[PDB]
Amino acid sequence: KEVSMDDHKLSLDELHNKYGTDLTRGLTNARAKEILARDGPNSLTPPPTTPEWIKFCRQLFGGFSILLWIGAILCFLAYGIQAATEDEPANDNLYLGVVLSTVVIVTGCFSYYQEAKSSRIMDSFKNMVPQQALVIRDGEKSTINAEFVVAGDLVEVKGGDRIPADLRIISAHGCKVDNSSLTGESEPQTRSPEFSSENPLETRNIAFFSTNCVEGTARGVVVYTGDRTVMGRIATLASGLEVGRTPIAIEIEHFIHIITGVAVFLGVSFFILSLILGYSWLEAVIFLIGIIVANVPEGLLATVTVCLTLTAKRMARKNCLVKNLEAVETLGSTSTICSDKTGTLTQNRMTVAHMWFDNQIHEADTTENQSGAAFDKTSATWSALSRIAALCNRAVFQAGQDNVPILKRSVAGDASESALLKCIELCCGSVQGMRDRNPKIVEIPFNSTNKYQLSIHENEKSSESRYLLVMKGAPERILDRCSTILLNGAEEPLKEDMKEAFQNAYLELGGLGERVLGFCHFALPEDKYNEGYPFDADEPNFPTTDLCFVGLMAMIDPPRAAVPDAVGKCRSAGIKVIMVTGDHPITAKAIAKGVGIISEGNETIEDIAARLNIPIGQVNPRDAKACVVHGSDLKDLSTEVLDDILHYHTEIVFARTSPQQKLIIVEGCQRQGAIVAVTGDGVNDSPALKKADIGVAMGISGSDVSKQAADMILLDDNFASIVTGVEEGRLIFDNLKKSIAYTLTSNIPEITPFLVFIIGNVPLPLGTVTILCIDLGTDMVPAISLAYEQAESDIMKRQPRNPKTDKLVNERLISMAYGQIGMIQALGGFFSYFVILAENGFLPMDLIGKRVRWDDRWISDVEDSFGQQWTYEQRKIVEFTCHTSFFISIVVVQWADLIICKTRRNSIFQQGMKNKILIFGLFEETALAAFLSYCPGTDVALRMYPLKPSWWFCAFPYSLIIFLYDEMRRFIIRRSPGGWVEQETYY
């Protein structure tokens, strides 16, 4: 309200003088470039951005890195205390602190890398398909990028277009704009060039930025561009989006919490145990750090952000642009698809196939030849038919088309009108001359209320009444509109027999799956209408009825190539497809039968009545699996009736349904408990698009209002792309589960040594430095490798998941990770431990109870099984050679676990080793383990000692055993559907 000063008071001359733009022509391109350079692009200054250093820093002091920081600090302080006391102390605490801090550094840089990757990929979706504007320059109308709009440019907007910048309305015809974002009221306000009010918020001749034109058309001049606009000031500072998370991310978070609580309880308890058992204050925190790190899966949040970002790039590659990240998750759950007939299933390239005049069915349209037509071009009725086809037609050909044939050229207008033009030019002659001879006095375009087209033409010839009215439309309606028919030049009144034959022709052509259009004309009497007589368009003066029906014209429109396979995949997938179209039930029923919506064998109530020769009312409604609901019937139906059709029928097709009724259909589909996706191109579709679970907007033809209203955008406007996208959506869940299943398996081998240490009273088999190396040091990359995975043959062959019953982390997951696979990686590490001690002189029987004496720095006399006497460091060295062995036995078993995890239904032989990131992980971990074991200095710094060669092999039988076991369990699942194995083991 405060910042308001406008040009609305200026007249056309004043506006022209100030802006300096040709009102009719618009500014020239050269001036446009100069203005663009001076003023700058038509865009809003972007917000600043977090610095690179602050984020990185958030990583250093985020996640659970805080615990490691406290541990490192404690180690440093402990070393400092040791400095005061006796001289020449052990730099053990000093190097321990140096190890923890490094872990935090590596984790911070890695997580930072992954987060940046995802943010940059999200930004790429901003300049793929931009937001445009229709401007007028040098007299020509052109489409240009929105940023290219300059002040003073003549912009034109129509119904459904977004307002590129604040404009001054020069001319308009029934333009209605919605200022809901500006004022708040959703009521559309009219816009006219007349100066209605002094204030900007009320003036009829000012269009504001960010608004959209609901209906009509208008032309204006850019008064403000970029940030200068009224809405721009509020949108820049006031409308900033906040950060948002998903439900996949929150299920994972909840789970992170439960595991964290159990882990912290176990830690603190072990801490008190160590103190009761005589350990050092520093070693107590050390044990706590090891237990917490070994139990809390810190990588899950990163693995989910990465999985969603990578999958999104795969979609954008396959024609599925998701406006939001939530849609990527919702697509996998799609249960029902409400798709349209024209634009999505078909191509919208009509061609004139057949005609019906002279009470006969005539073939036409020679295949790009001079053969003409199957019938006599001389026919008298044919002359009137082509006359109305050319005169009533709105479309015209563009320039530069004279070089090629008519089947190949371009046109401007509707698909049907274009088909009619191509037909008349091939068989009749030239439309330019025909339209010229019969001047069109007034014309009425296709209107929903009228449901017909209309054109008044003057006839230059003699013997005519000087008036020729021509109109086309729905054949059923035009036949009701005519009293006579032209046959071979002789006109005859329309009797019931002629109508019966006409209906037969309509049924014959419509059954074919062709769109039939009715055509008619009338020569109004000269006595009633003189030459001078003006016909009023606003108030119809001329007679609408008692016309002369010439004949019918039908066109063909093949479906897309990929569409049949797509419906087949949906049927195999368990997804329901509904066709909502404006056409006639015969054509709908047909197209649907051909594409696959109505498979063979299924019949509707009318079909069964027809076979049985019984009235449709008598037939049982439950007897038919599929049905074609009429729009009028849909309006008359109640909520229960709608639920009846949606529950009881497998294949539903809504014909003659207005796009507005889509909301009722979507609501009915949701009442059932299904996730629905609806396709929409126009403005009336927006409510349904918002109400539906997944709104799919047409990319090519969809308007800015629809695009804004939807979550997903179909770039090709094809239906198969939707199916391919849902295929990609299910892979996200499969890979996520395979990742959770992997990371969790190492918990049993990392924690069991501590438990055995306390209960068994044996020496510690696995240390904390090694635990950090396992979780934080090497598995970081293998955990991510599970997301790059491909899909399995069965991804489209299973049912849709329901959020109420299915969850990512279920009981069966814990059955496979903890119970079966884990316990095995624990035995493989324990085996390697027993072997190191046995070879060096400590046997297994002798080990139960040596801890009390073992951990006692003061007993330099420890006796082994063979009776030798060991010191403290000598004995400790063998213990450390066990921590390193354990470590390696873990990487070795990890091989079998990571390999088996790849697929859950099929074998790895069927799937294969085609994942490159995964293989890179097996080689890299093995390499890191060998490096940390063999490099010099590791003994003192990391406490890892060299491993002799006969030892590397101790974990091999447990790795082969894990692999063979999982292969057989996969086999039994594939062979016995719904068995005990699948109930218990399938996660």
């Binding site: 316990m823 324990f830 070879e839 002189g841 330099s860 009776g867 006497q869 060991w870």
Partner: protein, 294 residues
């Protein structure tokens, strides 16, 4: 939930499943954890086979040998009051525990303790490390050899009047032959006098140059009166082939010890296959903190 997920009576479910499910899961886990246990036991049995009963396969982690001592001092400090008797009890109980194994009653008969040279001698090889000639025979080591620290005369061993003893001992290693330094011009100062080739010398000193003066007369007791270990008690054949085997011992009396002051005394053995470590402060040498506060 709370109540219903515990026990419902329509589906006859307990905790979530019915009777036949809990039974199939329990049976599966029992059989599974049985195959797992049997495999681990087999892979461990082959490991027991692999190794030998008379000799550890790897002997690189224990060489050279350490040097332990009795008493059992925590932090390597021996601090006690000459008045309060309940101050050196933890020490005497240990010293006694160690010497209680050299009792003459234990060493009796021809086996498996044979009488050896009362004066240091050379090595003695009782064959190879086999079971062919049964249990080998070990040399006898008498208590009395240690003169003022034997617990036979003054049970306390010295701690009673400000004169403590420290029984040093060399860590037992299988097949380890001690090799003393030769008489060549390069040898420490100390070692020159009394170069009995057959004796491994042990000599204590002060860690710092200052403490020298505050440390009095280090009086070593041992076999033959020398400050070392006789080579005749080697090598060691291991528990299995030499049960009832006694390792030599060396007593050290720290007479004339300054009162009320912490003294750092470092003892060190010398020899060819003897090497010290800056990390392990018990490899070849040992440190003791003594403070007779009275």
């Amino acid at each position: 939930g709370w109540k219903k997920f515990l026990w419902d009576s329509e589906k006859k479910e307990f905790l979530g499943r019915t009777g036949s499910s809990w039974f199939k899961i329990f049976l599966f886990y029992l059989i599974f954890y049985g195959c797992l246990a049997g495999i681990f036991i087999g892979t461990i049995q082959v490991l027991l086979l692999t190794l030998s009963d008379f000799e550890p396969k790897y002997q690189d982690r224990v060489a050279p040998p350490g040097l332990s001592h009795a008493p059992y001092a925590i932090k390597t400090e021996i601090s006690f009051s000459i008045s309060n008797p309940k101050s050196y009890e933890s020490f005497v109980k240990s010293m006694h525990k160690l010497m209680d194994l050299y009792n003459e009653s234990s060493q009796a008969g021809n086996s498996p303790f044979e009488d050896c040279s009362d004066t240091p001698a050379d090595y003695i090889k009782r064959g190879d490390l086999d079971d062919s000639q049964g249990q080998k025979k070990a040399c006898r080591f008498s208590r009395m050899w240690l003169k003022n620290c034997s617990g036979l005369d003054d049970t306390t061993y010295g701690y009673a009047e400000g004169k403590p003893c420290v029984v040093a001992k060399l860590n037992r290693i299988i097949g380890f032959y001690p090799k003393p330094l030769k008489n060549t011009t390069d040898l420490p100062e100390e070692l020159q006098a009394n170069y009995n080739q057959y004796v491994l010398p042990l000599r204590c000193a002060a860690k710092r140059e200052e403490d020298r003066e505050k440390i009095g007369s280090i009086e070593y007791f041992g076999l033959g009166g020398y400050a070392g270990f006789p080579l005749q008690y080697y090598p060691y054949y291991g528990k299995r082939l030499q049960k009832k085997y006694l390792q030599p011992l060396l007593a050290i009396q720290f007479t004339n010890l300054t009162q009320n002051m912490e003294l750092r005394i470092e003892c060190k053995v010398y020899g060819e296959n003897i090497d010290y470590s800056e990390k392990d402060r018990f490899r070849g040498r040992f440190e003791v903190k003594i403070e007779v506060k009275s």
